Amino acid sequence: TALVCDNGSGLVKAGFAGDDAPRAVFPSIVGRPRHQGVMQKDSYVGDEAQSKRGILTLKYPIEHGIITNWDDMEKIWHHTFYNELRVAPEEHPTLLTEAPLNPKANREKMTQIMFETFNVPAMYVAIQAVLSLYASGRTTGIVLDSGDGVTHNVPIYEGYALPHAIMRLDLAGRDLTDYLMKILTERGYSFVTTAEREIVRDIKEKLCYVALDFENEMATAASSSSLEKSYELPDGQVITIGNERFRCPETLFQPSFIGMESAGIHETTYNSIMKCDIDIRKDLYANNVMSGGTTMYPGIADRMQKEITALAPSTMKIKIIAPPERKYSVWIGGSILASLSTFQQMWITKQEYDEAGPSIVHRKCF
Amino acid sequence: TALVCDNGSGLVKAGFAGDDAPRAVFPSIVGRPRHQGVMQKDSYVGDEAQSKRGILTLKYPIEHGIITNWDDMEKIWHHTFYNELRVAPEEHPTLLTEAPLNPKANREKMTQIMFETFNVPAMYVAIQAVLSLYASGRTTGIVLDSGDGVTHNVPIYEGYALPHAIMRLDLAGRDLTDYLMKILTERGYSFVTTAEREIVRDIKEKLCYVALDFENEMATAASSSSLEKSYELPDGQVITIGNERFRCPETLFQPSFIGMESAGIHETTYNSIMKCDIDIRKDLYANNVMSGGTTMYPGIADRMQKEITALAPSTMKIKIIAPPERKYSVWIGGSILASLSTFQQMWITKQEYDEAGPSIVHRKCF
Amino acid sequence: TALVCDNGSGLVKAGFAGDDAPRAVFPSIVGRPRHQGVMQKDSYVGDEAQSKRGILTLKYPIEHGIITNWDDMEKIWHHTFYNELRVAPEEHPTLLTEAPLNPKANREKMTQIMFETFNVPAMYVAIQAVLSLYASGRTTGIVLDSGDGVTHNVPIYEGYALPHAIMRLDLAGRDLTDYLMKILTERGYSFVTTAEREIVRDIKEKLCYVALDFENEMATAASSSSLEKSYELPDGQVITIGNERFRCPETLFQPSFIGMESAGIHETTYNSIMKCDIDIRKDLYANNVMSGGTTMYPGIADRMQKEITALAPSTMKIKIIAPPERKYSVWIGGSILASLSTFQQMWITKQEYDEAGPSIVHRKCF
Amino acid sequence: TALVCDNGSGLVKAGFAGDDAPRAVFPSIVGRPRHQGVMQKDSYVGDEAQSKRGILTLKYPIEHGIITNWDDMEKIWHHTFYNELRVAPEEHPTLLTEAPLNPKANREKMTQIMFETFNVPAMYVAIQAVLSLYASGRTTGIVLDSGDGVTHNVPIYEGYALPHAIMRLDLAGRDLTDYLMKILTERGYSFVTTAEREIVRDIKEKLCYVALDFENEMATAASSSSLEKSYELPDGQVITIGNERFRCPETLFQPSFIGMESAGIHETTYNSIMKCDIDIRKDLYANNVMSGGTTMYPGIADRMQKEITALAPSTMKIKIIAPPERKYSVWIGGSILASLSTFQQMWITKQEYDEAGPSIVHRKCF
Amino acid sequence: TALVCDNGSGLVKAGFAGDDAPRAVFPSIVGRPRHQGVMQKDSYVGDEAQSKRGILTLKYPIEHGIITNWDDMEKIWHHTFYNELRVAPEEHPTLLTEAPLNPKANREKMTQIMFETFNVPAMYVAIQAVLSLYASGRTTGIVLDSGDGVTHNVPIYEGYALPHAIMRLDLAGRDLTDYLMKILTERGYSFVTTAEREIVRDIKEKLCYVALDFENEMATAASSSSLEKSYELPDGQVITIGNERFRCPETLFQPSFIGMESAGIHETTYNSIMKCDIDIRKDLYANNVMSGGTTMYPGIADRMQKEITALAPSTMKIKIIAPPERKYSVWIGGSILASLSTFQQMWITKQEYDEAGPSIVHRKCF
Numbered sequence A, B, C, D, E: 001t002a003l004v005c006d007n008g009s010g011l012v013k014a015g016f017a018g019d020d021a022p023r024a025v026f027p028s029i030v031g032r033p034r035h036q037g038v039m040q041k042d043s044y045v046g047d048e049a050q051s052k053r054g055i056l057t058l059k060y061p062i063e064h065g066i067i068t069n070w071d072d073m074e075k076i077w078h079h080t081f082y083n084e085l086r087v088a089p090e091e092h093p094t095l096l097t098e099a100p101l102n103p104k105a106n107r108e109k110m111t112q113i114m115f116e117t118f119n120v121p122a123m124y125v126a127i128q129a130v131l132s133l134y135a136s137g138r139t140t141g142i143v144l145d146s147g148d149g150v151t152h153n154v155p156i157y158e159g160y161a162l163p164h165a166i167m168r169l170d171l172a173g174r175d176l177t178d179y180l181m182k183i184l185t186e187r188g189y190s191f192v193t194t195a196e197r198e199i200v201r202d203i204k205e206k207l208c209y210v211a212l213d214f215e216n217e218m219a220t221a222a223s224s225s226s227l228e229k230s231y232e233l234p235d236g237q238v239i240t241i242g243n244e245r246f247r248c249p250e251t252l253f254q255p256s257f258i259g260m261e262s263a264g265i266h267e268t269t270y271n272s273i274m275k276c277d278i279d280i281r282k283d284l285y286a287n288n289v290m291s292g293g294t295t296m297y298p299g300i301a302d303r304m305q306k307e308i309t310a311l312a313p314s315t316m317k318i319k320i321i322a323p324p325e326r327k328y329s330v331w332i333g334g335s336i337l338a339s340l341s342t343f344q345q346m347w348i349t350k351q352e353y354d355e356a357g358p359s360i361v362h363r364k365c366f
């Protein structure tokens, strides 16, 4: 059976092809003690690093979809195979995912490690947004995938990709977490360490939502306290936040909040559709597929619907497809693809990798 | 029963002899994907290529009545027989049409394919303008046939053709479509791809008309906006065009608009009549038969009547016969001819083709 | 009842003996298509060939009174009997006409066809000028007969012919038509085909006249435009001719216009009278009978009167008898002769033709 | 010194009387730009129009020997006098040529322009075929002259013309060029513009020849490729033609190829001889003089010899005189005539033109 | 003296007629601060915006030769007149340039601003490719002009334009810059902002070149590192690029690299020549004039020579004229045209603009 591993930037989602859900879901973190021991492992990975984060410095080996710490990335892959899935990687073909427009050396180094360190029989690196379309049972649609590191738009029509219309934005969940940490200082809450960043991320996932109209929401938050909610910190301290709940996700629609010049995800989606041929835009307007953890904010589909409707012609039918399980769409789509009989010719086996070299990994790479 | 196939340049009109209308009418196009697939046929034909034209490069295998891509032409014939008509071509004699003054090798290669690839029992290649006269129930008249590729005049008197008076002009619907694409840039509309050319062709068939007096119409279009009409593009964008509605068909009467030196269709019709014997001109003046899709513009018969009246002597009765179904006149006339008991000796059977060789196809070829 | 057929050269005049006018009058032409058919008889005869002459090559089987195309001559005789008169030639004796001084084989071959192809019971070949004298109710006079092919003078006195004084001139209507075609090129009108020759012949019969004094008429035509008349061609073009109206018939009086050395019809008439005995010249001078279509020009009798008066002695009374129906005088005279009880012994029956052979047809043949 | 100008239809041949060759030989064309200028004369004449024909519409002011555009004809005469010959026309008597049986107004208008626009001291309009006999040093012969516009036969015996035997045919070089353009479409070559007609004319003059036996030549051309020759177009494209080489000149012997009813030049020559007196036919048979550019095809004299021999009695000696310089025979003969001391009384001076008016130009006009 | 302003899309080139080089050359950009000030102009233009681009959002008011932001376009014109040239526009006639086949309203709005905002005495809008031919001292040639926004081919012969052969392609320098930004992500370099786009444009102008054979160059770049070059970013970071140097300009010859269906500039040039009359193609083949900044790549003339030679017949002489100063050819040609005494009648004065209205600006507009 095939292994499907979706290591985006924040989470590792790994399982077996054919299943409906990933077997192992844990943070893609490596923690090392920042104090000296007196009574003791060298490093902690995943959920283990998350439970001991008080005495650890947490590091993400993937930043903006690009693996920057390869020794830590091997630790995470090692724990995924042997501790979480408890398999021998030399017996299972492995389907990996990647964001589009990544550096070529990222996929090449990832292939060299899977074949020479873990000795997988075959492997394949798919594009994350394409797998999200498999999960929704569609052949046409523009996929907006947004995780912890990268947000990207990929339009697909009748099974054909339009690579020239692919848009990538280095604004995602991790940038929203850092922005929430910044604006939480307005209320006197100081989160600075890598362990406290994990607390702010949990605050973001519990309390943050997308306002349908940002300016009307800011007036409501300034008028009363009906939007304020409380959150209990791990030490028992209770914090209360008001407009920070919707100001943090608003960065997705106004990237200037964090000093970025790019347009929001609604205009990026619209600009990607407008780069496509005029005859396919109507189908793309009706098949906006949202994918990834950063699309899980309450009210984001209604806001995207409202924003794209204002940009598109009035006669087009704008339809945002936001399935409830869209946080696992990339993994579910990879589970479907790795189980197709037509896909079994697309595997890059260990034999044809020793012949063609690293150049073989860049097929269907846009 | 006999098959009647009228593949002019833009459309394939195929059916069975004896019927009143062609069974299959679809564009004579072959589309191939101009992007790479990621989720997938090699080529698309006819209406199938028209519905997926957003991701295709569309090619017409016939240009100016001459088959230039023979592999694509066989794809279209194959889909016509097996997918549209759903017959076995080895059981039906096939009547094909052709423009006059075509290259000899075009009809010879078309005959070799029908006998060796499709194994038809017999076949015949008629001239398109002669069939249009059959459709109108006449034996005398000058036929002005104009499709997507070629416009030609053929005078016939009492069942006798006058080949020396036959005139052919490589200005037809496709050249008008390209000219409309050019003058649509005056209003900021940019249609460049082969898929957008199909959109402009649909604009031409909906909104374009022939002005009775071109200079008075240009003054009216410059005075107000009573001539402007709107058209909704497939993506919801609404375009508005004014004098482009009648400037595009005016190229038929002023070929210098597209840089051609030839005279318009009115002078070509008059010059063809004046090459005929003086004793038959009166009957030709009263039997101007218009045929083909490019004669379907509103107001073209009144304009032709006005232009030829100004050229002919004042005592002649100019009568333009423009039947409402003249877009199918060639097919309808071919359906009548293929059902005549007198025509059953004119078939070129497979046996007499293996004996006389390709030379036998050039009988009654003018 | 007897059939009277007067086939001179240009027209077939056929009817029944006893009538006052020929039943069938049509051109002695056979037309064959000079183009190929595409939608169709092999040949057309008479008025049928005249109405379709635009696509035909017209041929006269009789040239200068001599039948040159015998297969076409049989077609004309066949259509005369079965289509125009609608009779069985095997039930009616047939009176035929002929110009004097014709080749002997012309009458012999004409007799063989009437007896072996049409199986007439009896036949007779009369001289055309003698029949014209029957029509005028005279026994004395010099007949000037002129049709399309031949002009001849035959003097008759008290019922006796003077064969040594018979004069024949191969200048008639067809030569005048060809001369009018030639001089019409002076005004830029080009008639060349056999169909256009029929148009010029119609122009000749409508507009041409004989000038009383040719040189005074040429000065009047060069002084103003009072002699110019217009004629509308079949295609609506209007032509205007001036002195060509009287220059064409002037060839009858000046045969040098067409390069002939002979004298005009006035001198030929005078020379024929002067070859007769001196005692009969006075009666011949007073009985100049004009006959045939070429004597139908306005002013020809006054011109003949003036010209012969200048040649004859001043004491002679010159009288030109030009009856209004002189175009049918030969047929009318043949109708009178074939109805005489004294003539019923002159028939050459089928029985006495099988005995004496072709030699019997040359009785009373001068 | 006298000027000799031979402007037939296609070429202007002008020079001085007494020379052996015309000084200026250039096409009788006027070209006007059919596009608009952006960086520029109004019109171009002769060789200048021929070198810029890519952006010009070329017009021949003479059609079928008849001047149809008088303003353009004056441009050509103006450039002939001032640019090509570089003379003052008011100092030189001008000998002009003309085809027989031309409209009277053509010579009258040509005389009015030479006397009132160019103020020539004297002028004379000769017949082209008569000058060709001067060039060959003969007094007896039938001249077959054929240029670009008109073909005509003029028999002359002992210095006397026989005008009644003069035959004129509006089939010449320009009609052969148009027929070659038509049959070149059989091989897929499309020449339509007036500039491309000049290319086809150059093809005709290089590759076309007269087949001795047309049917045997058609079998040879269909059997192999020994008759095929190549021609490089101005843009570098190479075309190959086979039987079109001899099918184009065959129209001279079979005018039905272009839909004309007339007989070929061999039968027209024979019919012209048979209209002459029987005593001069033997000398005409032995003195068939060919003249003009359209008689320059290789093998035309041998074909004419063969065709007329088959028509003439077997005891006659048929001799075709085709001198190598017969393309300039009309000009050379005009140079000889204008240098004769006996001809100096035949000039029509400016004084006697103001007295007699336009009527004086029609002397010795047949 | 006249002002010559060549504002294509990327650069403003302005000066005085009669000079050899433009006085002011600066980017056609308007920059506005994307952060808030704390210590400050509203907008920056040209070189001023380029030096402060770190804190600005840069906008080009011209996109694909079409002015889309008219308020910013007036800022650029204002700074050109008053800050760069330091003149009063009400004292100098202004020659402006434009790409062919532009929207009509672009030139009309540009004329209204020059006459009502700047009050120029007269103005004229020339076509850019026509001016390039003036700069090279030619009257015949096909000009390939390519700037930042648009690439167009204009064939001219003997001073006459062939508008029907004019081809326009919305692929130029800005599209190559965006494609280089895309393929630079393959090496891990992320340029996204409008300020970083200016850095990539500088990289393109320094290191990019046209490969003579693209596939052989891709093999050389994959074999070693002899093609790799380094570039120091403004912050001191050094980037190294290999095959991106020639893959970026290759888009000009393979527009499918950026998802465009059109053919490359070599086939577009060839197709434009093949739409011209056959008699002018030889001169166009020998006079391919390259113009604009996008033709400044090393090796582009040798590649164009090689590509067109493979398309043209082997006997044609292909000559690419790429002068070293061709980046200013449009301005230099406009300086020559505005100094011609023949051009002084072509100015559109303020008086005749108030009379004829905006319709007067479309003269010589193709």
Ligand SMILES: Nc1ncnc2c1ncn2[C@@H]1O[C@H](COP(=O)(O)OP(=O)(O)O)[C@@H](O)[C@H]1O
Pocket: A007, A008, A009, A010, A011, A012, A146, A147, A148, A149, A172, A173, A174, A201, A204, A205, A206, A292, A293, A294, A295, A296, A297, A327
């Ligand atoms: N309910 C939620 N609301 C808002 N953000 C969420 C939610 N759940 C997860 N996220 C964010 O999604 C990001 C991870 O996205 P995901 O696509 O699941 O993994 P990866 O980033 O590894 O591809 C994290 O930054 C996390 O904060």
Ligand SMILES: Nc1ncnc2c1ncn2[C@@H]1O[C@H](COP(=O)(O)OP(=O)(O)O)[C@@H](O)[C@H]1O
Pocket: B007, B008, B009, B010, B011, B012, B146, B147, B148, B149, B172, B173, B174, B201, B204, B205, B206, B292, B293, B294, B295, B296, B297, B327
């Ligand atoms: N209503 C219409 N008005 C104007 N043009 C039309 C109309 N309908 C069809 N056409 C044109 O006629 C052309 C096709 O003509 P037709 O004779 O039907 O087929 P073909 O060209 O294959 O012979 C096309 O170019 C199309 O744009």
Ligand SMILES: Nc1ncnc2c1ncn2[C@@H]1O[C@H](COP(=O)(O)OP(=O)(O)O)[C@@H](O)[C@H]1O
Pocket: C007, C008, C009, C010, C011, C012, C146, C147, C148, C149, C172, C173, C174, C201, C204, C205, C206, C292, C293, C294, C295, C296, C297, C327
């Ligand atoms: N009104 C007329 N004026 C002059 N010529 C006429 C007239 N009517 C007939 N003709 C000529 O007479 C000729 C025929 O003469 P006719 O004697 O009737 O017949 P045929 O020649 O057969 O004997 C024709 O050439 C015709 O052109």
Ligand SMILES: Nc1ncnc2c1ncn2[C@@H]1O[C@H](COP(=O)(O)OP(=O)(O)O)[C@@H](O)[C@H]1O
Pocket: D007, D008, D009, D010, D011, D012, D146, D147, D148, D149, D172, D173, D174, D201, D204, D205, D206, D292, D293, D294, D295, D296, D297, D327
């Ligand atoms: N070598 C040749 N072979 C065939 N045709 C020729 C040749 N040279 C000239 N011609 C034709 O002769 C015609 C011109 O004939 P010419 O008598 O010289 O001039 P014009 O027609 O003006 O009297 C042209 O149509 C030309 O095509």
Ligand SMILES: Nc1ncnc2c1ncn2[C@@H]1O[C@H](COP(=O)(O)OP(=O)(O)O)[C@@H](O)[C@H]1O
Pocket: E007, E008, E009, E010, E011, E012, E146, E147, E148, E149, E172, E173, E174, E201, E204, E205, E206, E292, E293, E294, E295, E296, E297, E327
């Ligand atoms: N040396 C060079 N190599 C490649 N491209 C260049 C070079 N110099 C300028 N360019 C490009 O040319 C474009 C501008 O072209 P130009 O014709 O000078 O101005 P405009 O586009 O305003 O007409 C810019 O996109 C620039 O990147």
Ligand SMILES: [Ca+2]
Pocket: A008, A146, A147, A148, A292, A293, A330
């Ligand atoms: Ca993800």
Ligand SMILES: [Ca+2]
Pocket: B008, B146, B147, B148, B292, B293, B330
């Ligand atoms: Ca058609």
Ligand SMILES: [Ca+2]
Pocket: C008, C146, C147, C148, C292, C293, C330
């Ligand atoms: Ca008669």
Ligand SMILES: [Ca+2]
Pocket: D008, D146, D147, D148, D292, D293, D330
């Ligand atoms: Ca000549």
Ligand SMILES: [Ca+2]
Pocket: E008, E146, E147, E148, E292, E293, E330
């Ligand atoms: Ca430029």
